[PDB]
């Protein structure tokens, strides 16, 4: 739980430091995500939505988007996955 | 002549700090000029021009815009003034 709290604090501090600098957009990347396509940022910018995330490939059914929360925030496979 | 090179320094050190803060626009008002209409910023913004200056009234013909520079940067009264 300490790890969760630390990550939460770090991300909220990043969000607050990206608001007092007068910036548009903020792109939360992490260590392992290989952003291969050079036009990822431009094609995400050019869609005009608030929160939007590219669908990153993987070797299994895993990816970085859900399609349903059961009751308390747990993954549930909708047929539209 | 040592006051021109100090007025210029102060402005150029503001246009420099209006760029290193990621800010649109910059309003150069000197604390002598009465800005009466409260909406003047909105009308100036909503015109979509690079350098635009409102016309301010005065007790005489003098205002805050020339209308013709002769050869050496001295005022010339063109008939359109």
From Swiss-Prot, chains A, B:
Annotated glycosylation sites: 48
Effect of residue 15 to R: In BSVD3; loss of galactosyltransferase activity
Effect of residue 32 to A: Loss of galactosyltransferase activity
UniProt-annotated location(s): Endoplasmic reticulum lumen
Expressed in which tissues: Ubiquitous with higher levels in placenta, heart, lung and spleen.
Record PTM: N-glycosylated.
Role summary: Beta-galactosyltransferase that transfers beta-galactose to hydroxylysine residues of type I collagen. By acting on collagen glycosylation, facilitates the formation of collagen triple helix. Also involved in the biosynthesis of collagen type IV.
Family note: Belongs to the glycosyltransferase 25 family.
Record's disease association: Brain small vessel disease 3: An autosomal recessive form of brain small vessel disease, a cerebrovascular disorder with variable manifestations reflecting the location and severity of the vascular defect. BSVD3 patients may have disease onset in utero or early infancy with subsequent global developmental delay, spasticity, and porencephaly on brain imaging. Other patients may have normal or mildly delayed development with sudden onset of intracranial hemorrhage causing acute neurologic deterioration.
Protein name: Procollagen galactosyltransferase 1
Species per Swiss-Prot/TrEMBL record: Homo sapiens
């Amino acid at each position: 739980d300490s790890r969760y709290e630390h990550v939460m604090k770090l991300r909220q501090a990043a969000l607050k430091s990206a608001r007092d600098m007068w910036a548009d957009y903020i792109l939360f990347v992490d260590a392992d995500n290989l952003i291969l396509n050079p036009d990822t940022l431009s094609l995400l910018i050019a869609e005009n939505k608030t929160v939007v995330a590219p669908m990153l490939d993987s070797r299994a059914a895993y990816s970085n988007f859900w399609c349903g929360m059961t009751s308390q925030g747990y993954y549930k496979r909708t047929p539209a996955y």
